Write a protein that binds this DNA or RNA. Structure first.
Length: 127
DNA sequence: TCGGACATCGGATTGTCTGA
């Protein structure tokens, strides 16, 4: 409603869940420092009614949140939770990114998620 | 101004229109 990821989601089109090699996965963001570049993706799988009136489960969306923000703001980095994967630029600081926070869609459009050139993605995520 | 309806999932964590 009024709290969202700063970024569009990575859509999972295949069987493989999202995951990244250590050091990879944090979006580009000119308002972020390297110390800021740590957080998680959270999976959201929606069940919706199609135009034929039949229900269907859409491809999962994985949204990025900086550490200590968003729906799992209280989770420490590395905590095991289904549908949460952790990412950090090497050397990022293990502190909540309060000053970045989350996005209010009434005030700001999402940034289309950009990963660093050469980032590895699992099959079924489109690059 | 702003809440809400609705689309067909693209972006619904939006886009678009518009009644109130």
């Amino acid at each position: 409603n009024n709290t969202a990821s700063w970024f569009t989601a990575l859509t999972q089109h295949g069987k493989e869940d999202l995951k990244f090699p250590r050091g990879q996965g944090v979006p580009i963001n000119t308002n972020s420092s390297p110390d800021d570049q740590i957080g998680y993706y959270r999976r959201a799988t929606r069940r919706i009614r199609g135009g034929d009136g039949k229900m269907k489960d859409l491809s999962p969306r994985w949204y990025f949140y900086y550490l200590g923000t968003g729906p799992e703001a209280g989770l420490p980095y590395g905590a095991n939770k289904d549908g949460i994967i952790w990412v950090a630029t090497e050397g990022a600081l293990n502190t909540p990114k309060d000053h970045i926070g989350t996005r209010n869609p009434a005030n700001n459009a999402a940034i289309v998620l950009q990963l660093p050139q050469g980032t590895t993605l699992p099959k079924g995520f489109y690059a």
